[PDB]
Amino acid sequence: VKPVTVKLVDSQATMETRSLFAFMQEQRRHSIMFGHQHETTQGLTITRTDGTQSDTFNAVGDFAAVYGWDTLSIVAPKAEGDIVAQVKKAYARGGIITVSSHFDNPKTDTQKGVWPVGTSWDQTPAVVDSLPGGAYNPVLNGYLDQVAEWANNLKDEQGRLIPVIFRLYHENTGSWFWWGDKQSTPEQYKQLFRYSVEYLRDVKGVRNFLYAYSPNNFWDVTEANYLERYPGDEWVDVLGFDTYGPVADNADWFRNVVANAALVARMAEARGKIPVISEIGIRAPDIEAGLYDNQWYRKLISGLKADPDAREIAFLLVWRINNGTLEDFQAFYADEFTAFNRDIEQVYQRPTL
Ligand SMILES: [Zn+2]
Ligand SMILES: [Zn+2]
Ligand SMILES: [Zn+2]
Ligand SMILES: [Zn+2]
């Protein structure tokens, strides 16, 4: 593979981090990688959470290509447990790692007791009071300090840093998180994102991150709408979105998935970014009611790859018998356009400028 030039948010990012970006730039027009949250640490069919097993592997004989985790495994109290070992196992497999922020509420996190008080889901506006000048800026900085120390020590067997796609303040166009759209003006949200990237990169010297932005799906699918809370080309490497749909009567929702994917794909080409579907799944009520769509994955891949823009996403990441759902996923795996962990190669040693 020949040298390419890449422009990242972190102009001093490691060679492997630059290569990851270059890899996705090429790969994304030849496949869509499959990603899964908690791939080797949570599952219905796994007997070890040490990073050696996954539901994906037990279903189709390979791991997800993209491994998703979150800061509940990094920032105290680390309720999901550490993931250093599991990240290293995934990287050793040539996998791609992405971590999303799920920060506690900096304004209320000492008040924890009755869920959701003090967590991401505590809707108490905390953006204004967590920026520099705000009373709770030191609390946010504590979270960012722990993310940075984690990233700065996240090393492979040769002592080299492991690249991570770090996805900040997701689903920010809704109001269920403290960084949401009822909790901040667009400018205040942009400041929260930018401040956090700058703190990690410049104050704490993180060199192994690509930065991802991921609002919810828009129903009015326009660039202007995506741009309202967009942190800016100087601050984002990866353009994503999050979408959760109905188990039944979901043709409209699937068209909307494709439309949003097409939008970020077109914007990504214009702006030198990687377009992705950062999170996709079925809304939580439908899954807890035991409902299922045994054509879900086949609809997903068929809709995406038929669309000339949506097909150019680098990956989609899904977040959590006899009903036909296993066969559906096996078909998705067998599809020529999906890529699982063994289907990707030469991710991290591509020469860049
Ligand atoms: Zn190509
Ligand atoms: Zn988690
Ligand atoms: Zn998300
Ligand atoms: Zn709203």
Short mmCIF file of C-alpha atoms and ligand atoms in Angstrom, two decimals:
data_model
loop_
_atom_site.label_atom_id
_atom_site.label_comp_id
_atom_site.label_asym_id
_atom_site.label_seq_id
_atom_site.Cartn_x
_atom_site.Cartn_y
_atom_site.Cartn_z
CA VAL A 1 0.00 0.00 0.00
CA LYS A 2 1.27 3.44 -1.04
CA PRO A 3 1.58 6.63 1.10
CA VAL A 4 -1.42 8.94 1.64
CA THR A 5 -1.86 12.28 3.41
CA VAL A 6 -4.31 12.47 6.33
CA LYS A 7 -5.59 15.49 8.26
CA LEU A 8 -6.63 14.60 11.81
CA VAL A 9 -7.92 16.61 14.72
CA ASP A 10 -4.69 15.65 16.47
CA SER A 11 -1.94 16.83 14.10
CA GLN A 12 0.60 14.86 16.22
CA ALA A 13 -1.30 11.57 16.36
CA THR A 14 0.73 8.35 16.32
CA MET A 15 1.53 6.54 13.12
CA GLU A 16 -0.90 3.73 13.94
CA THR A 17 -3.69 6.25 14.62
CA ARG A 18 -3.00 7.96 11.30
CA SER A 19 -3.00 4.56 9.59
CA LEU A 20 -6.36 3.65 11.12
CA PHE A 21 -7.86 6.76 9.56
CA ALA A 22 -6.22 6.00 6.20
CA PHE A 23 -7.46 2.41 6.38
CA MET A 24 -11.08 3.45 6.85
CA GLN A 25 -10.79 6.01 4.04
CA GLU A 26 -9.92 3.19 1.60
CA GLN A 27 -11.93 0.33 3.13
CA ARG A 28 -15.19 2.27 3.41
CA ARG A 29 -15.87 2.13 -0.36
CA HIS A 30 -15.37 -1.66 -0.47
CA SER A 31 -17.28 -2.85 2.60
CA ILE A 32 -19.13 -1.95 5.78
CA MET A 33 -17.46 -3.29 8.91
CA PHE A 34 -19.60 -4.81 11.62
CA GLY A 35 -19.22 -3.33 15.08
CA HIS A 36 -20.76 -4.39 18.39
CA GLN A 37 -20.84 -2.73 21.83
CA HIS A 38 -19.33 -4.86 24.61
CA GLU A 39 -18.35 -7.41 21.89
CA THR A 40 -16.15 -9.63 24.11
CA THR A 41 -17.23 -8.48 27.61
CA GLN A 42 -21.02 -9.03 27.52
CA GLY A 43 -23.15 -11.68 25.85
CA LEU A 44 -25.97 -14.20 26.24
CA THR A 45 -23.84 -17.14 25.02
CA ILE A 46 -20.35 -16.37 26.39
CA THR A 47 -18.86 -18.18 29.40
CA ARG A 48 -15.80 -15.90 29.82
CA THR A 49 -15.61 -12.07 29.74
CA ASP A 50 -11.81 -12.03 29.36
CA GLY A 51 -11.93 -10.88 25.73
CA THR A 52 -11.67 -14.34 24.09
CA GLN A 53 -15.36 -14.90 23.30
CA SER A 54 -18.33 -13.07 21.81
CA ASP A 55 -21.93 -13.74 20.83
CA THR A 56 -20.84 -12.68 17.36
CA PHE A 57 -18.19 -15.38 17.20
CA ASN A 58 -20.59 -18.02 18.53
CA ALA A 59 -23.12 -17.03 15.81
CA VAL A 60 -20.90 -16.78 12.69
CA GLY A 61 -17.36 -17.94 13.53
CA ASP A 62 -15.70 -14.53 13.61
CA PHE A 63 -15.57 -11.49 15.87
CA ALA A 64 -16.92 -8.07 15.03
CA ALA A 65 -14.34 -5.92 13.20
CA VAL A 66 -15.13 -2.93 15.41
CA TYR A 67 -15.22 -3.30 19.20
CA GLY A 68 -17.27 -0.75 21.13
CA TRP A 69 -16.85 0.08 24.81
CA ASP A 70 -17.59 3.15 26.95
CA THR A 71 -16.25 5.18 29.85
CA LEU A 72 -18.11 3.08 32.42
CA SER A 73 -14.99 0.90 31.94
CA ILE A 74 -12.50 3.79 32.37
CA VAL A 75 -13.71 6.55 34.69
CA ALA A 76 -14.27 5.79 38.38
CA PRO A 77 -16.14 3.93 39.66
CA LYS A 78 -15.65 1.81 36.50
CA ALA A 79 -18.95 -0.04 36.97
CA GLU A 80 -18.43 -2.14 33.80
CA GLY A 81 -14.93 -3.15 34.88
CA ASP A 82 -11.65 -2.51 33.11
CA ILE A 83 -11.22 -3.23 29.41
CA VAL A 84 -7.47 -2.81 28.93
CA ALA A 85 -6.88 -6.56 28.54
CA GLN A 86 -9.89 -7.01 26.25
CA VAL A 87 -8.87 -4.01 24.11
CA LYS A 88 -5.36 -5.45 23.78
CA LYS A 89 -6.76 -8.87 22.72
CA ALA A 90 -8.95 -7.17 20.11
CA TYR A 91 -6.04 -5.08 18.80
CA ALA A 92 -3.84 -8.20 18.60
CA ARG A 93 -6.55 -9.63 16.31
CA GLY A 94 -6.27 -6.56 14.08
CA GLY A 95 -9.59 -5.21 15.39
CA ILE A 96 -10.63 -1.56 15.58
CA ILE A 97 -11.51 -0.03 18.96
CA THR A 98 -14.11 2.65 19.70
CA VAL A 99 -15.05 4.08 23.10
CA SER A 100 -18.02 6.39 23.76
CA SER A 101 -18.25 8.85 26.64
CA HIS A 102 -20.94 8.10 29.24
CA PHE A 103 -19.83 10.67 31.80
CA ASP A 104 -21.64 11.22 35.06
CA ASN A 105 -23.30 14.60 35.59
CA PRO A 106 -20.53 16.95 36.87
CA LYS A 107 -23.07 19.16 38.65
CA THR A 108 -24.79 16.34 40.56
CA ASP A 109 -22.49 13.30 40.68
CA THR A 110 -21.95 13.48 44.48
CA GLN A 111 -25.74 13.05 44.91
CA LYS A 112 -25.83 9.47 43.58
CA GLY A 113 -28.21 7.04 45.28
CA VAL A 114 -31.53 6.97 43.48
CA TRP A 115 -30.96 6.23 39.80
CA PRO A 116 -30.55 8.20 37.58
CA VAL A 117 -29.28 11.01 39.84
CA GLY A 118 -25.69 12.00 39.09
CA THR A 119 -25.34 9.86 35.92
CA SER A 120 -25.42 10.62 32.19
CA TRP A 121 -29.19 10.17 32.43
CA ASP A 122 -29.58 12.88 35.07
CA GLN A 123 -31.07 15.59 32.83
CA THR A 124 -30.02 18.44 35.12
CA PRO A 125 -28.30 20.92 32.77
CA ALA A 126 -24.57 20.72 33.43
CA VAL A 127 -22.90 22.14 30.30
CA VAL A 128 -22.78 25.81 31.30
CA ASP A 129 -21.50 25.01 34.80
CA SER A 130 -18.82 22.53 33.55
CA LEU A 131 -16.98 24.77 31.06
CA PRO A 132 -14.01 26.80 32.37
CA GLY A 133 -15.36 29.41 34.78
CA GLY A 134 -18.14 27.07 35.84
CA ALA A 135 -18.27 25.71 39.37
CA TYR A 136 -18.13 22.09 38.18
CA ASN A 137 -15.33 22.39 35.64
CA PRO A 138 -12.93 20.54 38.03
CA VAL A 139 -15.37 17.60 38.13
CA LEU A 140 -15.50 17.29 34.33
CA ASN A 141 -11.70 17.65 34.27
CA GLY A 142 -11.42 14.69 36.64
CA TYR A 143 -13.30 12.51 34.14
CA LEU A 144 -11.13 13.75 31.29
CA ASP A 145 -7.96 13.17 33.35
CA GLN A 146 -8.91 9.53 33.78
CA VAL A 147 -9.74 9.09 30.10
CA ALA A 148 -6.34 10.61 29.22
CA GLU A 149 -4.32 8.49 31.67
CA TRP A 150 -6.13 5.41 30.31
CA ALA A 151 -5.37 6.35 26.69
CA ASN A 152 -1.78 7.34 27.48
CA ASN A 153 -1.03 3.90 28.95
CA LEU A 154 -3.05 1.83 26.49
CA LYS A 155 -0.17 -0.03 24.89
CA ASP A 156 0.39 -3.16 22.82
CA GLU A 157 3.10 -5.80 23.33
CA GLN A 158 5.76 -3.56 21.75
CA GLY A 159 4.90 -0.61 24.02
CA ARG A 160 3.13 1.30 21.21
CA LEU A 161 -0.17 3.11 21.80
CA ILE A 162 -3.39 1.47 20.64
CA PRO A 163 -5.60 3.75 18.49
CA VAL A 164 -9.14 4.40 19.73
CA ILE A 165 -12.08 6.14 18.06
CA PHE A 166 -13.32 8.23 20.99
CA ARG A 167 -16.93 9.35 20.59
CA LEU A 168 -17.89 12.37 22.69
CA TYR A 169 -21.32 13.44 24.03
CA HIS A 170 -23.49 11.30 21.74
CA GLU A 171 -27.25 11.65 21.15
CA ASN A 172 -26.86 15.36 21.90
CA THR A 173 -29.79 16.44 19.71
CA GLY A 174 -32.17 14.91 22.30
CA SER A 175 -32.63 15.86 25.96
CA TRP A 176 -32.16 12.59 27.87
CA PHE A 177 -28.47 13.35 28.71
CA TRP A 178 -27.13 16.33 30.68
CA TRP A 179 -25.27 17.56 27.57
CA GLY A 180 -28.45 17.50 25.47
CA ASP A 181 -30.46 20.05 23.52
CA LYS A 182 -32.62 21.29 26.43
CA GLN A 183 -29.46 21.53 28.54
CA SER A 184 -27.37 23.77 26.27
CA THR A 185 -27.51 26.19 23.38
CA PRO A 186 -25.84 24.88 20.21
CA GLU A 187 -22.78 27.09 20.94
CA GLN A 188 -22.53 25.80 24.51
CA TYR A 189 -22.60 22.20 23.29
CA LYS A 190 -19.92 22.97 20.69
CA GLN A 191 -17.82 24.51 23.46
CA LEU A 192 -18.25 21.41 25.65
CA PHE A 193 -17.07 19.16 22.80
CA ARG A 194 -14.18 21.40 21.73
CA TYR A 195 -13.06 22.03 25.30
CA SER A 196 -13.00 18.29 25.99
CA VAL A 197 -11.00 17.43 22.83
CA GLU A 198 -8.56 20.27 23.54
CA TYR A 199 -8.16 19.17 27.15
CA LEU A 200 -7.39 15.57 26.13
CA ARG A 201 -5.10 16.46 23.22
CA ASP A 202 -3.33 19.60 24.43
CA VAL A 203 -3.53 19.59 28.23
CA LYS A 204 -3.10 15.82 28.72
CA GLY A 205 -1.17 14.92 25.55
CA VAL A 206 -3.39 12.15 24.19
CA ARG A 207 -1.96 11.05 20.83
CA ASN A 208 -3.93 7.88 20.06
CA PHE A 209 -7.48 9.20 19.54
CA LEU A 210 -9.62 9.85 16.54
CA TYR A 211 -12.64 11.97 17.58
CA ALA A 212 -16.22 11.08 16.63
CA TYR A 213 -19.41 13.15 16.68
CA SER A 214 -22.76 11.32 16.73
CA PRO A 215 -26.13 13.09 17.15
CA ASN A 216 -29.40 11.22 16.79
CA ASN A 217 -30.90 10.48 13.42
CA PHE A 218 -32.74 13.43 11.93
CA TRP A 219 -36.24 12.99 10.49
CA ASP A 220 -35.69 16.17 8.50
CA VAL A 221 -32.51 14.94 6.87
CA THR A 222 -30.53 18.07 5.96
CA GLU A 223 -26.94 19.23 6.26
CA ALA A 224 -28.16 22.39 8.04
CA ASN A 225 -29.80 20.30 10.76
CA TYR A 226 -26.68 18.14 11.25
CA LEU A 227 -24.56 21.31 11.40
CA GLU A 228 -26.54 23.05 14.15
CA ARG A 229 -24.63 21.34 16.98
CA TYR A 230 -21.68 20.09 14.89
CA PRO A 231 -18.41 20.93 16.71
CA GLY A 232 -16.62 21.75 13.42
CA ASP A 233 -14.13 20.23 10.97
CA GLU A 234 -11.20 21.23 13.24
CA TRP A 235 -12.64 19.09 16.03
CA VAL A 236 -14.09 15.95 14.44
CA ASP A 237 -12.51 13.04 12.50
CA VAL A 238 -15.53 10.76 12.30
CA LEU A 239 -19.10 11.80 11.37
CA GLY A 240 -21.64 9.45 12.82
CA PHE A 241 -25.13 9.22 14.22
CA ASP A 242 -27.16 7.00 16.57
CA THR A 243 -30.53 5.51 15.71
CA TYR A 244 -32.95 3.13 17.42
CA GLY A 245 -36.05 1.93 15.62
CA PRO A 246 -39.24 -0.08 15.97
CA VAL A 247 -39.31 -3.86 15.76
CA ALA A 248 -42.47 -3.72 13.60
CA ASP A 249 -43.61 -1.61 10.65
CA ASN A 250 -40.05 -0.30 10.26
CA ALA A 251 -39.78 0.40 6.50
CA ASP A 252 -39.94 4.18 7.15
CA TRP A 253 -37.29 3.92 9.86
CA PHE A 254 -34.94 1.90 7.63
CA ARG A 255 -35.32 4.51 4.88
CA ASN A 256 -34.39 7.09 7.51
CA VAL A 257 -31.31 5.06 8.52
CA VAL A 258 -30.21 5.04 4.89
CA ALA A 259 -30.95 8.77 4.47
CA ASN A 260 -28.89 9.77 7.52
CA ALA A 261 -26.04 7.45 6.47
CA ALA A 262 -26.15 9.03 2.99
CA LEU A 263 -25.99 12.50 4.49
CA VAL A 264 -22.96 11.84 6.68
CA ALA A 265 -21.31 10.00 3.79
CA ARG A 266 -21.69 13.01 1.49
CA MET A 267 -20.59 15.44 4.20
CA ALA A 268 -17.65 13.19 5.09
CA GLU A 269 -16.39 13.17 1.50
CA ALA A 270 -16.64 16.97 1.32
CA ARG A 271 -14.90 17.48 4.67
CA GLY A 272 -12.22 14.75 4.68
CA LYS A 273 -13.95 12.71 7.42
CA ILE A 274 -14.94 9.09 7.98
CA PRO A 275 -18.72 8.53 7.91
CA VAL A 276 -20.21 5.81 10.15
CA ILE A 277 -23.36 4.60 11.84
CA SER A 278 -22.08 4.92 15.41
CA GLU A 279 -24.98 3.13 17.10
CA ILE A 280 -27.93 1.28 15.66
CA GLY A 281 -30.45 -1.03 17.27
CA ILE A 282 -34.08 -1.68 18.17
CA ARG A 283 -35.58 0.62 20.81
CA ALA A 284 -35.33 -0.79 24.35
CA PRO A 285 -39.08 -1.34 25.06
CA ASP A 286 -39.50 -3.69 22.07
CA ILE A 287 -36.56 -5.89 23.14
CA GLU A 288 -37.75 -6.10 26.76
CA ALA A 289 -41.21 -7.12 25.49
CA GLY A 290 -39.50 -10.09 23.79
CA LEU A 291 -40.31 -8.84 20.27
CA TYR A 292 -38.04 -9.41 17.28
CA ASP A 293 -37.58 -8.70 13.57
CA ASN A 294 -36.04 -11.75 11.87
CA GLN A 295 -35.31 -9.72 8.71
CA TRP A 296 -33.63 -6.79 10.53
CA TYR A 297 -30.02 -7.38 9.48
CA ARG A 298 -30.94 -8.32 5.91
CA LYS A 299 -32.98 -5.10 5.57
CA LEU A 300 -30.09 -3.14 7.08
CA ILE A 301 -27.34 -4.34 4.75
CA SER A 302 -29.56 -4.38 1.64
CA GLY A 303 -30.75 -0.81 2.21
CA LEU A 304 -27.31 0.57 2.97
CA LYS A 305 -25.34 -1.07 0.17
CA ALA A 306 -27.96 -0.26 -2.54
CA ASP A 307 -27.62 3.46 -1.77
CA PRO A 308 -24.54 5.01 -3.47
CA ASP A 309 -23.82 7.33 -0.53
CA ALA A 310 -24.91 5.28 2.50
CA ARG A 311 -22.82 2.32 1.29
CA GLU A 312 -19.68 4.45 1.85
CA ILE A 313 -19.93 4.32 5.65
CA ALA A 314 -16.90 2.61 7.18
CA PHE A 315 -18.87 0.70 9.81
CA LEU A 316 -22.13 0.32 11.68
CA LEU A 317 -22.13 -0.65 15.34
CA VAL A 318 -24.99 -2.50 16.93
CA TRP A 319 -25.82 -1.99 20.58
CA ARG A 320 -27.79 -4.82 22.23
CA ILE A 321 -33.83 -19.26 19.27
CA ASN A 322 -36.04 -20.85 16.55
CA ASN A 323 -37.37 -17.33 15.73
CA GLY A 324 -35.18 -16.92 12.61
CA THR A 325 -32.93 -14.16 14.02
CA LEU A 326 -29.75 -16.27 13.97
CA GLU A 327 -30.29 -17.07 10.27
CA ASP A 328 -30.85 -13.36 9.58
CA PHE A 329 -27.50 -12.46 11.17
CA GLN A 330 -25.74 -15.34 9.44
CA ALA A 331 -27.01 -13.96 6.11
CA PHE A 332 -25.67 -10.52 7.07
CA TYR A 333 -22.27 -12.10 7.80
CA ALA A 334 -22.32 -14.01 4.49
CA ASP A 335 -23.08 -10.82 2.56
CA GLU A 336 -20.09 -9.86 0.35
CA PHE A 337 -20.22 -6.23 1.55
CA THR A 338 -19.98 -6.87 5.33
CA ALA A 339 -16.56 -7.14 6.95
CA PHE A 340 -15.86 -8.89 10.25
CA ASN A 341 -12.50 -9.09 12.04
CA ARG A 342 -10.72 -11.55 9.68
CA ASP A 343 -11.99 -9.60 6.66
CA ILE A 344 -9.88 -6.55 7.46
CA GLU A 345 -6.11 -6.43 7.04
CA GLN A 346 -3.22 -3.93 7.11
CA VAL A 347 -5.13 -1.46 9.29
CA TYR A 348 -2.34 0.00 11.40
CA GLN A 349 0.94 0.01 9.39
CA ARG A 350 -0.14 1.98 6.33
CA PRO A 351 2.34 4.78 5.56
CA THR A 352 0.96 8.31 5.88
CA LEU A 353 2.10 11.95 5.54
ZN ZN B 1 -10.87 1.66 -3.36
ZN ZN B 2 -21.27 -0.09 28.45
ZN ZN B 3 -24.15 6.68 20.65
ZN ZN B 4 -35.32 18.67 21.28
#
